[PDB]
Design a protein around this motif. Sequence first.
Motif, PDB file in Angstrom:
ATOM      1  N   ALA A 106       0.849  -1.230   0.000  1.00 24.42           N
ATOM      2  CA  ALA A 106       0.000   0.000   0.000  1.00 24.42           C
ATOM      3  C   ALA A 106       0.873   1.264   0.000  1.00 24.42           C
ATOM      4  O   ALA A 106       0.607   2.218  -0.730  1.00 24.42           O
ATOM      5  CB  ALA A 106      -0.818  -0.084   1.289  1.00 24.42           C
ATOM      6  N   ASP A 107       1.909   1.288   0.799  1.00 24.42           N
ATOM      7  CA  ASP A 107       2.796   2.477   0.847  1.00 24.42           C
ATOM      8  C   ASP A 107       3.532   2.647  -0.488  1.00 24.42           C
ATOM      9  O   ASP A 107       3.741   3.763  -0.964  1.00 24.42           O
ATOM     10  CB  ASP A 107       3.777   2.156   1.968  1.00 24.42           C
ATOM     11  N   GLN A 108       3.937   1.562  -1.094  1.00 30.68           N
ATOM     12  CA  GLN A 108       4.671   1.650  -2.391  1.00 30.68           C
ATOM     13  C   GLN A 108       3.776   2.225  -3.499  1.00 30.68           C
ATOM     14  O   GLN A 108       4.229   3.015  -4.324  1.00 30.68           O
ATOM     15  CB  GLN A 108       5.068   0.210  -2.717  1.00 30.68           C
ATOM     16  N   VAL A 109       2.524   1.842  -3.551  1.00 30.04           N
ATOM     17  CA  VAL A 109       1.635   2.374  -4.631  1.00 30.04           C
ATOM     18  C   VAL A 109       0.814   3.572  -4.140  1.00 30.04           C
ATOM     19  O   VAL A 109       0.236   4.306  -4.939  1.00 30.04           O
ATOM     20  CB  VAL A 109       0.699   1.228  -5.016  1.00 30.04           C
ATOM     21  N   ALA A 110       0.744   3.780  -2.846  1.00 29.07           N
ATOM     22  CA  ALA A 110      -0.043   4.929  -2.285  1.00 29.07           C
ATOM     23  C   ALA A 110      -1.538   4.586  -2.255  1.00 29.07           C
ATOM     24  O   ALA A 110      -2.393   5.439  -2.476  1.00 29.07           O
ATOM     25  CB  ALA A 110       0.224   6.133  -3.197  1.00 29.07           C
ATOM     26  N   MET A 111      -1.863   3.339  -1.982  1.00 28.20           N
ATOM     27  CA  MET A 111      -3.305   2.934  -1.931  1.00 28.20           C
ATOM     28  C   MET A 111      -3.582   1.949  -0.777  1.00 28.20           C
ATOM     29  O   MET A 111      -2.669   1.411  -0.153  1.00 28.20           O
ATOM     30  CB  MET A 111      -3.583   2.275  -3.284  1.00 28.20           C
ATOM     31  N   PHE A 114      -7.195  -3.003  -0.030  1.00 27.89           N
ATOM     32  CA  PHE A 114      -8.166  -3.481  -1.045  1.00 27.89           C
ATOM     33  C   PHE A 114      -7.705  -3.036  -2.423  1.00 27.89           C
ATOM     34  O   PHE A 114      -7.823  -3.793  -3.387  1.00 27.89           O
ATOM     35  CB  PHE A 114      -9.537  -2.901  -0.705  1.00 27.89           C
ATOM     36  N   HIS A 115      -7.155  -1.851  -2.573  1.00 28.37           N
ATOM     37  CA  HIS A 115      -6.700  -1.497  -3.935  1.00 28.37           C
ATOM     38  C   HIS A 115      -5.455  -2.331  -4.311  1.00 28.37           C
ATOM     39  O   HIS A 115      -5.251  -2.656  -5.478  1.00 28.37           O
ATOM     40  CB  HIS A 115      -6.452  -0.004  -4.049  1.00 28.37           C
ATOM     41  N   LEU A 116      -4.665  -2.756  -3.344  1.00 32.22           N
ATOM     42  CA  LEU A 116      -3.503  -3.646  -3.668  1.00 32.22           C
ATOM     43  C   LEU A 116      -4.086  -4.899  -4.323  1.00 32.22           C
ATOM     44  O   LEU A 116      -3.627  -5.351  -5.371  1.00 32.22           O
ATOM     45  CB  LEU A 116      -2.824  -3.952  -2.318  1.00 32.22           C
ATOM     46  N   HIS A 117      -5.143  -5.421  -3.755  1.00 29.19           N
ATOM     47  CA  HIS A 117      -5.826  -6.597  -4.372  1.00 29.19           C
ATOM     48  C   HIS A 117      -6.203  -6.221  -5.819  1.00 29.19           C
ATOM     49  O   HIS A 117      -5.900  -6.940  -6.769  1.00 29.19           O
ATOM     50  CB  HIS A 117      -7.086  -6.825  -3.529  1.00 29.19           C
ATOM     51  N   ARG A 118      -6.809  -5.063  -5.996  1.00 28.69           N
ATOM     52  CA  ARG A 118      -7.177  -4.568  -7.373  1.00 28.69           C
ATOM     53  C   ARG A 118      -5.931  -4.547  -8.288  1.00 28.69           C
ATOM     54  O   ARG A 118      -6.011  -4.877  -9.469  1.00 28.69           O
ATOM     55  CB  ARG A 118      -7.704  -3.145  -7.158  1.00 28.69           C
ATOM     56  N   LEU A 119      -4.775  -4.206  -7.758  1.00 28.67           N
ATOM     57  CA  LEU A 119      -3.511  -4.211  -8.583  1.00 28.67           C
ATOM     58  C   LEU A 119      -3.155  -5.680  -8.922  1.00 28.67           C
ATOM     59  O   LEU A 119      -2.873  -6.029 -10.066  1.00 28.67           O
ATOM     60  CB  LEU A 119      -2.451  -3.595  -7.654  1.00 28.67           C
TER      61      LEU A 119
END
Length: 139
Positions: A106-111, A114-119
């Motif tokens: 989450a910190d690496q993408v800024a999300m 749940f959005h990590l799952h989306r990635l």
Amino acid sequence: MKKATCLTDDQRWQSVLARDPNADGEFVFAVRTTGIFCRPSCRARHALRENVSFYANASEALAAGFRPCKRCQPDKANPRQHRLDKITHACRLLEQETPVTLEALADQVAMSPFHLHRLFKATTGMTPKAWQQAWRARR
DNA sequence: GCAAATTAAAGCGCAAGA
DNA sequence: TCTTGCGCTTTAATTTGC
Ligand SMILES: [Zn+2]
């Protein structure tokens, strides 16, 4: 299949037009008409092969004095599958400890987690947090 | 030659459902 | 309490015109 001295630009182009994710990372294609060089599977648009050349890596293309496509430059070509192997490891962490671990992602993408799952679905192609659960069910 | 406009596509955020 | 699917927006690059 069918490979010249490690640069069948002719089929590389067939890969560039075929968006073969298997030639992505292996070479790039630089359209001199726009001064850009994308991967064989660029998702933005295309120019004729005419002004299009091929490179072993984006740095070679980058060395041709071209501007890397902000769509093909930030994402990963053959390295794509390798970054997807990393996410699978994310599944292990989500089933290895007790509290779930996405904080580094989450910190690496800024999300959020749940959005990590989306990635995970975006890169893997069609299964975000569900790919995390499945892998964990078989791992 | 140099620019602008268009089209296309991917992914993020939101929602709803179970 | 958690999850996943879908949509829409934004981003980007390409094309054509003069
Ligand atoms: Zn591209």
